[PDB]
Symmetry: C2
Subunit: 96 residues, 2 copies
């Protein structure tokens, strides 16, 4: 329902940008450190970081789930923003 949305198309698009920037950063961190984790693993034998590696692997899927949620929110806000903007265009031109 459009009556419930108190943000303008431009405001929706400003918010959206924060979510996509956020998604990209979280992904950049995850990928960088996923790699660090392997550099360490390869260059360090023993069980001394086994608990860290297991906690990391277990949390990792939560982190990719998060990055994709943020990107999905960006996409939805963008689409809703276009819909509302088009609604204003139509009301202004089709209503006398």
């Amino acid at each position: 329902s459009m009556a419930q949305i108190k943000l303008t198309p431009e405001e929706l698009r400003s918010s959206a940008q924060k979510y996509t920037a956020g998604s990209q950063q979280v992904t950049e961190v995850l990928n960088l450190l996923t790699q660090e984790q392997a550099v360490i693993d390869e260059n360090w034998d023993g069980s001394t970081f086994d608990s860290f590696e297991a906690q990391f692997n277990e949390l990792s899927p939560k982190i990719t789930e998060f990055a994709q949620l943020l990107e999905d929110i960006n996409q939805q806000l963008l689409k809703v923003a276009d819909i509302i903007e088009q609604t204003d265009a139509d009301i202004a031109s089709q209503i006398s």
Copy 2:
């Protein structure tokens, strides 16, 4: 350990910077989730709100893990640096 103290410290820096960046994103977008909720009445946005809220605690756990890894890498680096100095002194 095939890694020098310097390499360990360079790696540690990445974990702590990553920890901070992940936390900053969570913080910014937690605030933005509240702005949208306050400015979008009804239950339409409830699904995105719910997913975000469920994941939030795990994002916090993840940032804390990165900082813990950072701190241990730094401790290990200190230990190995003393070892390097003792070996060098012994041979010299």
